[PDB]
Nucleic acid binder design. Structure first.
Ligand SMILES: Nc1ncnc2c1ncn2[C@H]1C[C@H](O)[C@@H](COP(=O)(O)OP(=O)(O)OP(=O)(O)O)O1
Ligand SMILES: [Mn+2]
Ligand SMILES: [Mn+2]
Length: 430
DNA sequence: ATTATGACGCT
DNA sequence: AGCGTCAT
């Protein structure tokens, strides 16, 4: 009853760019705008691999991970933009720099947690409190929420999507008690007003559109974000959770998309997030461990406490390349040349990072994969990163891996390497 | 031959 | 530390 926490203490948003790498390429090249188009890396093997798809192209069935030649079978007029290649490898710098553009705009409104190259969480609790005093018990006009969906509405007592959106929004606003400065629903609404403003700023100042979710925690905010994409934002209230979760596959919730989620389904014989409410906390802890069990018990009730961490910059800087099938590295000279290529891109990014962000990495992590293994990584070894010098870093990387070579022969490498990875970690201020 | 990343958990 | 999981 009165002592039962409801996880309504915070206002959290998740802002996620719409078909991000595609929009970066469409800003650069106007011919690609408002077209079925995708971003591809490499070209020689089956037209290259698709890593981003415009909403026009999705309508034809084009998806991420599809080969471009296969995508063209679904969409013959599909337009393609290629990822830049430097030192023999895909180079994602243009998209990292576009990410920074967006992150710096978001940071003007609130402290953000960078969650990926194209999304960040926002803790809006304080900003909401401030806007609420500005408002002075003034009602929130629908005009302040021109792209917002209220999940679960309209309900009860109609043909257009925008018409439905506004119907739901009006039901929501009509019910709001604006007199209470601590009503969670009011706080979420004001949160949504601020995110409309954030999203307008991102679009005005970069040309990029995005979607967003507004709720009381990160997991619900992310789920909300995807409910109405592209170019829209969705408010998921605490009250909307039982209906929303009653038909929500468990795999849809962040962190449950893999083996744990499959185990929840198999062991408990359920399909939907809401079905978890029928287990005790101890029951869930018995199956899934103390931490997961407690997390699941609260999460299926819409409650989660993971903070929006104040971190805008990535914690690691890495450079990775696969060498699939017959391209696998089988000579020492091969392995050394590619370590140098990776090390050279790493040095470039590290040096820029040091100038921009007043920090220095102190540890170099080296990872490889060997033909036959189908783990992502076969071996991970660390060494000291004492200077930003590609020749030194690549020599050091070779040193820490060179005894993986089963070859009795100096010059040959066996088994061949199907992946190399250099990652700079453990930053210190400088 | 679903690539290039990047965060966090376990022991 | 080195490995595994989950993510975009
Ligand atoms: N598995 C991947 N491999 C390589 N790059 C990826 C992968 N997933 C995502 N990316 C890149 C390209 C994406 O444009 C960008 C953002 O990813 P994501 O938010 O999942 O989709 P998206 O922004 O392209 O479309 P949308 O978010 O509108 O569905 O990150
Ligand atoms: Mn996105
Ligand atoms: Mn994303």
């Amino acid at each position: 009853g009165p002592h039962m926490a409801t996880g309504q203490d915070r206002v959290v948003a998740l802002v996620d760019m719409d078909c991000f790498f595609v929009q970066v390429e469409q800003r650069q090249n106007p011919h690609l705008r408002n077209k079925p188009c995708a971003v591809v890396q490499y070209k020689s093997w089956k037209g290259g691999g698709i890593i981003a798809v415009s909403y026009e192209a999705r309508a034809f069935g084009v998806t991420r991970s599809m080969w471009a030649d296969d995508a063209k079978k679904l969409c013959p007029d599909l337009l393609l933009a290629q990822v830049r290649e430097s030192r023999g490898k895909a180079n994602l710098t243009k998209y990292r720099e576009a990410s920074v553009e967006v992150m710096e705009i978001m940071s003007r409104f609130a402290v953000i947690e960078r969650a990926s190259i194209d999304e960040a969480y926002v803790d809006l609790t304080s900003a909401v409190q401030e806007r609420l005093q500005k408002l002075q018990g003034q009602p929130i006009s629908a005009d302040l929420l021109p792209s917002t969906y209220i999940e679960g509405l309209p309900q009860g007592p109609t043909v257009q999507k925008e018409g439905m959106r506004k119907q739901g929004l009006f039901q929501w606003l009509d019910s709001l008690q604006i007199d209470n400065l601590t009503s969670p629903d009011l706080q979420l609404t004001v949160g949504a007003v601020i995110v409309e403003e954030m999203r307008a700023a991102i679009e005005r100042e970069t040309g990029f559109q995005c979607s967003a979710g507004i709720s009381h925690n990160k997991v619900l905010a992310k789920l909300a974000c995807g409910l109405n994409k592209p170019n829209r934002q969705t408010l998921v209230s605490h009250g909307s959770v039982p209906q929303l979760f009653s038909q929500m596959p468990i795999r849809k919730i962040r962190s449950l998309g893999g083996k744990l989620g499959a185990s929840v389904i198999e062991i408990l014989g359920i399909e939907y997030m809401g079905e978890l409410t029928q287990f005790t906390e101890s029951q869930l802890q018995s199956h899934f461990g103390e931490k997961n069990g407690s997390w699941l018990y609260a999460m299926c009730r819409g409650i989660e406490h993971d903070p929006v961490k104040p971190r805008q910059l990535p914690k690691t800087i890495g450079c990775s390349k696969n060498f699939p099938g017959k391209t696998a590295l089988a000579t020492r000279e091969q392995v050394q040349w590619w370590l140098l290529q990776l090390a050279q891109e790493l040095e470039e990014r590290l040096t820029k990072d040091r100038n921009d962000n007043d920090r220095v990495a102190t540890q170099l992590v080296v990872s490889i994969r060997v033909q036959g293994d189908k783990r992502l990584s076969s071996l991970r070894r660390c060494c000291a990163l004492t200077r930003y010098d590609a020749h030194k870093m690549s020599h050091d990387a070779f040193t820490v891996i060179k005894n993986c070579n089963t070859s009795g022969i100096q010059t040959e490498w066996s088994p061949p390497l199907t992946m190399l990875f250099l990652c700079a970690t453990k930053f210190s201020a400088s």
